[PDB]
């Protein structure tokens, strides 16, 4: 795209980041309220709020993928870039699918809530997040390839990629930990467990938001360096 | 006011009536959903929907009081009209107060829901409706006075007033019936009772909406007859 | 307004006239279908179609009043013009009120239809039309005053005013005739009467549409002569 | 506008000219058919075809006015140009009004044809054409001013302006002649006269089409010279 | 564009070149027939054939400009390239305008032919050709810039550019010669002159076709070298 | 644009200049307070105030670029002007990008402040300013071209351009000096250095504000001279 | 506009005239104080007071232009009136521009005062005044046209226009004289010259105030005569 | 308005009447002093006192017009009343305009007094009074209509209206006489004439004060009768 398109889309990206931050703060609020005064309708409303937070994350990742396609068309594709963009477009579609899946089981839970339904819903949230994580790993791989293809020497870019690789390994570890406690919950579901689990989910989402911040710093540094 | 003001306000009134009808249909839907698949979070969400429906009714009654004030200033006050308008303005303020009361105990229920809280909330809904009923009786008394003061001979107006008086006596009977089953619920609260009770509430609200329709026909006939 | 505004508004007027003609043809169709195969749901749907046709007529009269206000501001007010425009604005508001009244009793009929309700609805249609007639008389009086104030000597204009005065006296006679058969129906209501009556209504509406055509010719001739 | 807009609009102009020529040929055909086998339905259909031909001329003049506004914004306004463009915009609106007037009396004739209605319709066609003529005189005055403002020395332009001034004086004379035979017809209406008159109308329209051709040559020469 | 678009468009270009060659051969035929048996209707038909040949050249130049825009978007704009492409787009629009001008004066000649009209038409053909020449000079300048911007070392490209620069200077000389004999004809118009002149026109068009062949060799060599 | 648009936009420009001056005074205040009582939270708040001051500068440069686009469309583009405006539009987008980058690392510093983060933030402020400088150099080159294209002989304009060229060379020198001390700080970071550095930043911003004042004097003189 | 709008705006005009008179008296005071005790800070403060006086004059001329637009819309435009109002709107925008220019060089003088800066400031005041003069000449030409268009025979109006033409020619002569002494000062700048010059400026402003008084008498007479 | 508003405004009216009486006595004093010891500065100061007396009359008429607007809104408008109130509001604005005109030529006289200026000032006073007279005639017509609309049978009101009509005819005669001697003065201006004229002015003002007294008695009787 043109510099006007790229710049406009980065303004939309930073707007989406501000909205994502605000939603993360709100989710932390309702997580505290649930911790202090846990109840069945509180659990249902908290889960629905988590679903809307995830939908904001998905829109953030869509805008990032759009910006990257404009950036790569600016610089030019390469073999490894083209294979990573085909992987990115696949993961984007898989995410839209899992987003619809999550929203539909959310509506089932809202209509007919029960503890078993909360367990199933939490496990489906953990699978949706694992798909977001894979989307972020592919986006990070694309940015790694774009920087290596440019041969960009900016120490600000190298520093931001060291941050992005650290955030990616941290996000893998947090994803594994969340799948582990999810398998615990599935074995021993209880309201106290549902609360501890939703807490760990909110920590995982916070780590994903940090990942999206680092990704946005890499995009901004690249767009300045080209 | 001028004929433009009255006509504009009647456009706002008919818009509010269409909105009220739409909300009544929606409320009947969720009442059926609650009847078929009753649950605690369904009860909480149903009660919150009743609160938003009542807020729409209150705005309808506010617009009616505004129209009547413009109509009476058009025709001129009289002793009994002025005394009924002072009674109307008092009842309007009492309704704004009870509306805030209901919204605040609604937020308490949403935050900390339980069966006892649902009973208390249903009793406060029944008191809010009883205040709406008194508001409608005073508005009907005002229209009765305006027509008798004009000495208006239109048989369409007399017919609509016979409808309005029948609807008013019906609304007294329905209010008494709802207070009776409310005193039963308070004595013997149960989920099955909470469901049967919310059903009776929705029937009472439907009768109030019929009353507001007849009231709007009387206002339209009066504004045409002057 | 400016010549661009007036011309645009006359394009809107001629568009509304084409729509009105199309609706009149459609209404004649359903009148024939009702005559051939009369039934209760056919009666209800015919009345609802008459209500939508009347709403189109009312929008036509609104556009005519707008155009006349722009024309008079173009030429300049005069004592009799200003008094007639205040009479026109009053009749416009009264018409918006009666339009809402009719739509609301239409919804009552649709929801709770019966032969008595059809009679009451037909009488309310006849009153709505009588208000349309008064709106047309005031609009014709305004155009008579505008032409006399300009002192316009065009024989095409004089001819169109002879047509407009003939159409106005014809419309008074037709209105009286329709009120007469309405008083018959109210005395002796029957399905055969409801059919004959709805036929006479549709004839009356056709005469109103002829009046609106002549009115539009007068506006076009005036706007060309200034 | 940009050179792409001007070129596109001149392609639209030449397309409209080809369509206008085709319509003129068709109109000459039906004029001959009417001359050979004159009849009432032939007269009505011939007049309706004249109305559609005039609508094509009006669209041609709208496109010419658009092109001139883009051309003048290209060169820059001047006092006499701006006053002539305000005269052009007024004449454009007056023409849209008379076009709607003509179409509506056309529909009246088609619906209720008679010899008197044919006379009135032919006279209204002659007035519509006289308005087209005034539109063309203003467009020619604008082009005269644009060329004199540029101080353009091209002998091809001077030749085309000598053609345009000759065509304009010819069009004044032909318009006067057509108004003269129209006043004859109005005095002595007969089918033989209606036929001879429609023939003279079609000759007048042909002269207007020649005027529009010369106007388009002037626009093309100007757009090449800037 | 993509390699599929570029290749398809070059297939369209070579198709247009074959069509242009065929048309040039046909035009030489009718030029000989006119030389052997010159006559007024032969002159008119020959001129119309020249107009259709020029229209084919114009379509060829449109396709060349399209291909160049796809090629430059492939390589990237540069200051001098962007300024030459804006000059090219201007010349393209000027050519579409002059093409319409020529077609319209062609139709005037066909309808009302005379020796004076043939002289004027031949002079307008010579001006149209001079515009084609300027279009070709700009296209050649664009290709010169594209090759210099790539820094392309292919001796086949350098050879084709030496041919293109020689053809361009030859085309300037031939254009000047044709304007000289055109000024003679305008001074001393005669049928023998019209024939000798149309012969010189056909020679000039043949030189333009040679220019378009060399241009196409440069485009093909560039598209292979990138 | 019209004289109203240009004048309104220059009123917005002078309003932005007054706001920029006020912000510069405020920044000098807090710079002194930091010098007298330096502390980590004082450093963080000072840096955030510098970021808001830079955002005001960026809005000032956007309004200047808007005015220049209206001015050039008033006079007409030229080759060197169009190339400089494309350079300006690119630099405008690059500035919006770097502005978002700065705001995001500002939020990172505010959330997780430390001395290392202050060093990195100061280096990013110096890069943002260097981009503002490049924006101002391009704007000055554009104004130089507009004046030379008009061939404007006003001695007031020549004087203001000698001021603008002196301010531009001064701004280059100050930018280089600030990058030099930034490389010192990066080598030897300390609180005392951070303070001395923020002082030099504020001096650099003051020089940019002088540049924007001279630019506005040139725009005002040009708009009067056209 | 309506009689209320015109009258209100004339109340604003007479208020602005009273304020202008008061400011002229104050400026004469400080002019005398400067003459008696001339000094650099006295010169700076006197010049700033002259700038605020000129800003009051500019607001006076804005209100006058507003009133004239309401008056002409009351009576109706004409060709020469419309061209003079376009000239007035242009001069109004040019004045707002020169007003901003003056205020900004005023702030430059206040911040960095010197004898050279005082000379430059006085020359810019003289240019600002020359623009005020042109604004007043255009306003007087508009009033001359409005009166001639009305064909107003009132001897009070003719007398006031003879006064207005005399004041206008006097203002031209005074403007030329002030430009002459300005060219002296620029040639031979000295504190004694700066003082003598500021004296001549204050005399010129007094003559402008007399012009605005006569203009207001003409507006009042016209508004009474319409 | 309310009875409190009407009563308060009538208290303001009676206060203004007392002030008007006091001012009339003072003006008679200075008229006598001028008669005994006539001189140019006595003439100037007397005229300025007449201007302040006229300003008091204008404020009296404003308060009366306010009271009438409250009274008519109390009773209700009618066709002739509404047309007279529009005439009253117009005359009120025209009077505010002529009041400003008089005050401004008063300031011109005070600043630059001379015998010619005194004559011109006296003629402008006589025109100002003629506008006051027309204001009073319109106010009397409004009161005549208000009383006739009420159909008020009070003999006190009929008597006061016979007084008001006599005062009105007397005021017409006195106005004509004053215009006659004003036309004498304009023909034969002299100090002895200026004195005799100011005397006749003071007699006219006394008649206006009698008119305002009768008008206020009629308002008081009406407000008691409603």
- C-alpha B153/C-alpha B226 separation (Å) is 11
Residue in chain D closest to E97 (alpha carbons) equals D7
| Chains touching chain E, criterion 3+ CB pairs below 8 Å | D, F
| Residue in F78, F81, F82, F90 to test binding to E, most E beta-carbons within 10 Å | F82
Residues in F touching G108 (Cβ below 8 Å): 213
Structure tokens at H115: 């015998």
Residue burial H63-81, b: 16+ Cβ < 10 Å; e: rest? bbbbbbbbbbebeeeeebb
Q: Element (H or E) spanning B45, and its range?
A: helix B40-75
Residue in chain A closest to B30 (alpha carbons) equals A111
Distance, in angstroms, between H76 CA and closest chain C CA? Answer: 15
- C-alpha H100/C-alpha G4 separation (Å) is 14
- What are the Cα distances from residue G163, in Å, to B223, G14, G64, G145, G217? 61, 19, 18, 16, 10
Structure tokens at B221: 């006939």
Helix (H, G, I), strand (E, B) or coil at C80: helix
Residues in C touching D101 (Cβ below 8 Å): 217, 220-221, 224
- What are the Cα distances from residue E152, in Å, to A200, E156, E221? 61, 10, 10
Distance, in angstroms, between D205 CA and closest chain E CA? Answer: 18
Q: Element (H or E) spanning C40, and its range?
A: helix C40-75
- F60 contacts F211 by C-beta, under 8 angstroms: no
How far does CA C219 lie from the centroid of its chain?
16
Distance, in angstroms, between H77 CA and closest chain C CA? Answer: 12
- C-alpha D59/C-alpha D125 separation (Å) is 17
Residue in chain F closest to E86 (alpha carbons) equals F79
- What are the Cα distances from residue F217, in Å, to F18, F143, G47, H89? 14, 11, 19, 50
| Chains touching chain A, criterion 3+ CB pairs below 8 Å | B, F
- Experimental method reported for this structure: cryo-EM
Distance, in angstroms, between G83 CA and closest chain D CA? Answer: 7
Residue ranges of alpha helices (H) inside B112-189 are: 115-150, 155-187
Note whether B40 contacts A37, CB cutoff 8 Å: no
Note whether B17 contacts C105, CB cutoff 8 Å: no
Query: Taking Cα atoms as reference points, which of A39, A60, A57 lies closest to residue A198?
Result: A39
Three-point CA angle E96, E99, E104, nearest 5°: 130
- What are the Cα distances from residue C126, in Å, to B11, C171, C184, C211, G84? 22, 13, 13, 17, 58
Which among B33, B37, B44 has the least Cβ separation from residue A41? B44
- C-alpha D45/C-alpha D33 separation (Å) is 11
- D216 contacts D173 by C-beta, under 8 angstroms: no
Distance, in angstroms, between G78 CA and closest chain D CA? Answer: 10
Residue ranges of alpha helices (H) inside A76-153 are: 79-111, 115-150
- C-alpha H67/C-alpha H63 separation (Å) is 6
Which among B3, B6, B220 has the least Cβ separation from residue C101? B220
Residue in chain C closest to B221 (alpha carbons) equals C101
Note whether G101 contacts F213, CB cutoff 8 Å: no
**Residues of H contacting chain G (CB within 8 angstroms):** 89-90, 93-94, 96-98, 100-101, 103-105, 108
Distance, in angstroms, between C221 CA and closest chain B CA? Answer: 30
Query: Taking Cα atoms as reference points, which of D4, E138, E80, E71 lies closest to residue F83?
Result: E80
- C-alpha B19/C-alpha B11 separation (Å) is 12
Distance, in angstroms, between E188 CA and closest chain D CA? Answer: 18
Note whether C104 contacts B4, CB cutoff 8 Å: no
Helix (H, G, I), strand (E, B) or coil at F48: helix
Measured between its terminal Cα atoms, the distance across chain D in Å is 13
Q: Which residues contact H4 (CB under 8 A, 6 or more apart)?
A: none
Distance, in angstroms, between D78 CA and closest chain G CA? Answer: 10
**Residues of G contacting chain H (CB within 8 angstroms):** 3-4, 6-7, 10-11, 14, 17, 213, 216-217, 220-221, 223-224
- C-alpha C132/C-alpha C139 separation (Å) is 11
Residue in chain A closest to F101 (alpha carbons) equals A220
- C-alpha H169/C-alpha H167 separation (Å) is 6
Q: Quick check: do G and H touch, 3+ CB pairs under 8 A?
A: yes
Number of helical (H) and strand (E) elements in chain H, helices listed first = 6, 0
- C-alpha E121/C-alpha E124 separation (Å) is 5
- D110 contacts D50 by C-beta, under 8 angstroms: no
Burial of C134 (0-12, 13-18, 19+ CB in 10 A): middle
| Residue in D77, D81, D83 to test binding to G, most G beta-carbons within 10 Å | D83
- C-alpha D96/C-alpha C8 separation (Å) is 9
- C-alpha F59/C-alpha F132 separation (Å) is 11
CB atoms within 10 A of CB G94: 18
CB atoms within 10 A of CB B125: 24
Residues in D touching E89 (Cβ below 8 Å): 3-4
- E212 contacts E60 by C-beta, under 8 angstroms: yes
Residue in chain F closest to E82 (alpha carbons) equals F83
Resolution (A): 3.6
Residue in chain E closest to F86 (alpha carbons) equals E79
Residues in G touching F11 (Cβ below 8 Å): 96, 100
Residue in chain A closest to F90 (alpha carbons) equals A3
- C-alpha E214/C-alpha E64 separation (Å) is 12
- C-alpha C115/C-alpha C120 separation (Å) is 9
Note whether D96 contacts C11, CB cutoff 8 Å: yes
- Evaluated on CA atoms A122, A128, A132, A137, the torsion sign reads positive
- C-alpha D124/C-alpha C155 separation (Å) is 12
Burial of D69 (0-12, 13-18, 19+ CB in 10 A): middle
- C-alpha A172/C-alpha A208 separation (Å) is 10
Q: Quick check: do E and H touch, 3+ CB pairs under 8 A?
A: no
Distance, in angstroms, between F225 CA and closest chain A CA? Answer: 32
CB atoms within 10 A of CB B37: 11
Query: How many CA atoms, within 13 angstroms, populate the side-chain half-sphere of residue C157?
Result: 19
- B134 contacts B211 by C-beta, under 8 angstroms: no
Phi, psi torsion values for A151, nearest 5 degrees: 70, 35
Note whether A220 contacts F89, CB cutoff 8 Å: no
Helix (H, G, I), strand (E, B) or coil at F169: helix
Residue in chain G closest to H120 (alpha carbons) equals G156
- C-alpha C145/C-alpha C151 separation (Å) is 10
- C-alpha C137/C-alpha C90 separation (Å) is 13
């Amino acid at each position: 795209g043109s510099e006007e398109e790229i710049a406009k889309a980065l303004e939309e990206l930073v707007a989406s980041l501000a909205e994502l931050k605000r939603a993360t703060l709100k989710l932390l609020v309702i997580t505290e309220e649930l911790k202090k005064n846990p109840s069945e309708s509180a659990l249902v409303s908290h889960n629905k709020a988590i679903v809307e937070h995830n939908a904001i994350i998905v829109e953030n990742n869509r805008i990032i993928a759009a910006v990257l396609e404009l950036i790569v068309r600016a610089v030019g594709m390469t073999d490894e870039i083209l294979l990573a963009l085909l992987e990115l477009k696949a993961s984007t579609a898989r995410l839209k699918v899992a987003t619809a899946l999550l929203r539909m089981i959310t509506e089932e839970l809202k209509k007919n809530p029960s503890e078993d339904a909360l367990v199933e819903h939490n496990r489906a949230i953990v699978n949706h997040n694992a798909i977001i994580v894979e989307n972020n790993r592919i986006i990070a791989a694309v940015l790694e390839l774009i920087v290596r293809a440019l041969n960009l020497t900016d120490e600000e870019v190298r520093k931001a990629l060291e941050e992005l690789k650290a955030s990616t390994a941290e996000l893998k570890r947090a994803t594994a930990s969340l799948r582990a406690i999810t398998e615990e919950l599935k074995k021993n579901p209880s309201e106290d467990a549902l609360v501890e689990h939703n807490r760990a989910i909110v920590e995982h989402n916070a780590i994903i938001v940090e990942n999206n911040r680092i990704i946005a710093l890499v995009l901004l540094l690249i767009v300045l360096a080209i």
